[PDB]
Amino acid sequence: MIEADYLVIGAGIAGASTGYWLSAHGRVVVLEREAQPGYHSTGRSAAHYTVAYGTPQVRALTAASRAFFDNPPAGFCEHPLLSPRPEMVVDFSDDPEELRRQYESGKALVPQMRLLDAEQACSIVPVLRRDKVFGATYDPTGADIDTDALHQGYLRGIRRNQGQVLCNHEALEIRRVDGAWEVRCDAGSYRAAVLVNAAGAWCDAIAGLAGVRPLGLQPKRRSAFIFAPPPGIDCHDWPMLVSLDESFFLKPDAGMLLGSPANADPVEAHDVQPEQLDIATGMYLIEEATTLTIRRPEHTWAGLRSFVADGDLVAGYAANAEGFFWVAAQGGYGIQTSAAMGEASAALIRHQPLPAHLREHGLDEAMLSPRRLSP
Numbered sequence: 001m002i003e004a005d006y007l008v009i010g011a012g013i014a015g016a017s018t019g020y021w022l023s024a025h026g027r028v029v030v031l032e033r034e035a036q037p038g039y040h041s042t043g044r045s046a047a048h049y050t051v052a053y054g055t056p057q058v059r060a061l062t063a064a065s066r067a068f069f070d071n072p073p074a075g076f077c078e079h080p081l082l083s084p085r086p087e088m089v090v091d092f093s094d095d096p097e098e099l100r101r102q103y104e105s106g107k108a109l110v111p112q113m114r115l116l117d118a119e120q121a122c123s124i125v126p127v128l129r130r131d132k133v134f135g136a137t138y139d140p141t142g143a144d145i146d147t148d149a150l151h152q153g154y155l156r157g158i159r160r161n162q163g164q165v166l167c168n169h170e171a172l173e174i175r176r177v178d179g180a181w182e183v184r185c186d187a188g189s190y191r192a193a194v195l196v197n198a199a200g201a202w203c204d205a206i207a208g209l210a211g212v213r214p215l216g217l218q219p220k221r222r223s224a225f226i227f228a229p230p231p232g233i234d235c236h237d238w239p240m241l242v243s244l245d246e247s248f249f250l251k252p253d254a255g256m257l258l259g260s261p262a263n264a265d266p267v268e269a270h271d272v273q274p275e276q277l278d279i280a281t282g283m284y285l286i287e288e289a290t291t292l293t294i295r296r297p298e299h300t301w302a303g304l305r306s307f308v309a310d311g312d313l314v315a316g317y318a319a320n321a322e323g324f325f326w327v328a329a330q331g332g333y334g335i336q337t338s339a340a341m342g343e344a345s346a347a348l349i350r351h352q353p354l355p356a357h358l359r360e361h362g363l364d365e366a367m368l369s370p371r372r373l374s375p
């Protein structure tokens with residue numbers, strides 16, 4: 001039996017970020033089922049940062065994370081965590097009212113957000129079919145996140161603070177014993193006053209082991225693929241391109257193009273594989289919007305974006321289950337919100353007020369709590 005102050009289940013971006021901030025204050029042990037911490041959703045994302053995405057809570061958590069991403073502590077990473085990648089949202093269906101509403105809402109959080117005419121959008125991504133383009137919004141402040149460096153920075157930070165990150169440690173049994181939570185894995189047993197449930201799409205399964213009422217988390221499959229651009233076009237500086245109705249996105253990645261139908265098909269938590277229909281739909285939508293020809297994609301994959309009913313993230317203690325803390329419902333936002341989520345969850349776990357910089361973005365206990373869910 002190994003004792004800790006905080007026992008975290010899951011070493012994806014959620015558990016790693018929460019563990020990182022906790023590790024400054026006590027002994028953290030993170031238990032991870034897989035052989036590597038980023039095998040599931042955290043290693044399968046499109047890795048983009050944009051404030052104007054998701055619910056108001058998500059936008060606040062994303063905005064509040066930028067300070068850390070732009071100024072992490074010395075030794076956290078070797079190179080910047082963010083690289084410039086503006087986002088251009090293109091109207092392909094001639095909906096000027098919706099385009100205006102997205103522009104106005106985005107500009108309220110991003111003063112530099114711009115409204116583009118069709119010619120401006122096509123100047124930026126010249127493969128757009130001009131007769132299908134009706135205008136766009138443009139966020140000059142978007143960025144790509146180096147997920148590997150961020151995730152490894154969190155994990156290394158735990159270990160440098162005398163915490164432990166234990167892979168091949170699937171939590172199999174969980175029990176409240178003598179005022180603490182005890183977790184049995186095949187390799188070893190662990191005890192801590194606080195159990196942090198950061199198990200991604202499996203958070204409700206972890207609650208099931210513990211006898212704690214689950215949240216109603218719904219994992220949803222999203223597939224993506226990479227394909228080669230035609231030999232004559234340099235697309236490496238293109239923005240992240242999204243359609244106005246979120247039917248697809250397309251962004252440069254490692255000399256290739258990364259596409260997705262931006263799907264969200266509800267599934268059980270599992271090691272999710274891409275579906276042929278997903279890939280074909282994404283290819284069709286990109287070929288409908290652009291002059292690109294997509295041959296058989298060179299690599300395809302899928303990951304899970306897991307949501308509760310209201311689309312907001314969850315960080316808070318369970319009602320009626322002492323010491324059981326949810327870090328859940330990251331949706332499609334877990335990487336871009338991870339700095340604010342990690343710092344806020346650590347404060348809440350420790351029963352401390354949220355730091356002032358988070359409060360200035362409108363973050364508080366109530367907006368994050370699982371107890372807002374009803375019934």
Ligand SMILES: Cc1cc2c(cc1C)N(C[C@H](O)[C@H](O)[C@H](O)COP(=O)(O)OP(=O)(O)OC[C@H]1O[C@@H](n3cnc4c(N)ncnc43)[C@H](O)[C@@H]1O)c1[nH]c(=O)[nH]c(=O)c1N2
Binds near residue numbers: 046170200222304
């Ligand atoms: C295609 C695509 C594209 C994007 C995105 C997703 C997808 C699929 N996302 C979303 C992002 O991927 C998602 O929000 C986070 O990776 C969720 O991180 P978690 O740590 O919650 O889950 P994650 O699945 O990474 O970690 C949970 C961990 O818990 C472990 N676990 C489960 N059960 C266990 C047990 N019994 N014992 C021990 N360990 C256990 C798992 O093995 C797993 O490693 C995204 N986000 C974003 O911010 N920007 C973006 O651009 C995108 N884009």
